[PDB]
């Protein structure tokens, strides 16, 4: 039995005692108890000690589940001695437009993390050794390029999709044993007669190669071979086929500049059915949001993150590590993570149907206490 005080707004739970919060009183009774409007009936009677969790939220008001979970990285000015980064965690439906849209397939950005340069592309990130000057010239990074800083939260979210390093050619500099003209050396490139194709020379044949990789292969070695020589369409068939596993892209990459693109976001959207959440990479002038919501940034007490959440959430997280299972977490409207020990206890708060949220974004939220029946008595 729960009694709401008329003027103090204090809650008393009766079992065989006052309670800090409505969550604490609903957890202990084993049911989502609506409190009676009793004030002289408890103030004139016996009192006790304050039970319940203090760190827990007052109530658990879930709203419509959030469509997108997004990490946003904002760099006010790249041209600085040491630039500052502001992290925004948007747990709401995103607003896309001409100013802030998702990055194109042939588009990327340069970022510096822990004294290393990374190249944030469409689906992830790649380790670029900016000293590999010929490679950066083939990809499209200008000589006047400079990387900017990037958040740890955003860096972990962006999948590492391998470095942009040409694979070493084991018999480099050796003469062509395949029978191709003596000008062609092993570690060289050949062109052929709509769109022409480039081939790289290897010890046991030749392999096809995109323009970015052909450019970089010639610029890193050359071997005195000015311009790629032409080969017929037939002479290449007698020579065997090999596969160069070059990570470089086909079209040269347009490098976004932070002075034009001050916000870099990564976004996760749970999809229906057996689909895999759609992860998009977004860049722009501002945060991907409507103007009306620009003022509601909840600065996190215990974190360098500004939370733009809309209503409470009930979520389930599945980690790929087997030693880590799957966990339910309640997120209040302030954007604070509160773990839930079990299904029975989730039913005592009126929380049903936890939706899937990412570990990438939910891990960055401040972790408050756990909503267990056992943890109330303290």
Residue numbers in the entry: 75 to 90, 96 to 117, 119 to 273, 276 to 460
Question: From the publication, what sentences describe this entry?
Answer:
The ESX-1 type VII secretion system is an important determinant of virulence in pathogenic mycobacteria, including Mycobacterium tuberculosis. This complicated molecular machine secretes folded proteins through the mycobacterial cell envelope to subvert the host immune response. All ESX gene clusters contain at least three or four ESX conserved components (Ecc), named EccB, EccC, and EccD, with EccE being present in all ESX systems with the exception of ESX-4.
In order to gain further insight into the role of EccB1 within the ESX machinery we determined the crystal structure of the C-terminal domains of EccB1 from M. tuberculosis (EccB1mt) to 1.7 Å resolution and of the orthologous protein (MSMEG_0060; EccB1ms) from the nonpathogenic mycobacterial species M. smegmatis to 3.07 Å resolution. Both EccB1 structures contain a single elongated fold in the shape of a distorted propeller, which has an unanticipated quasi 2-fold symmetry. A structural comparison of the EccB1mt and EccB1ms structures shows that they are highly similar with an r.m.s.d. of 2.7 Å for the superposition of 381 amino acids (Dali Z-score 42.2); there is considerable variability in the conformation of the extensive unstructured loops connecting secondary structure elements which are, themselves, relatively well conserved Five domains are present in the structures including a core domain flanked by two repeat domains on either side. EccB1ms contains a corresponding set of repeats in the same arrangement as seen in EccB1mt: R1 (residues Q75–K127) is membrane proximal, R4 (residues G392–L447), the central core domain, R2 (residues Q187–P243), and R3 (residues G267–E323) which is distal to the membrane. ESX-1 is responsible for secretion of the important virulence factors EsxA and EsxB as well as other virulence-associated proteins (e.g., EspB, EspF, EspJ) that are secreted to the cell surface or extracellular milieu based on recognition of a conserved C-terminal signal sequence on the secretion substrates.
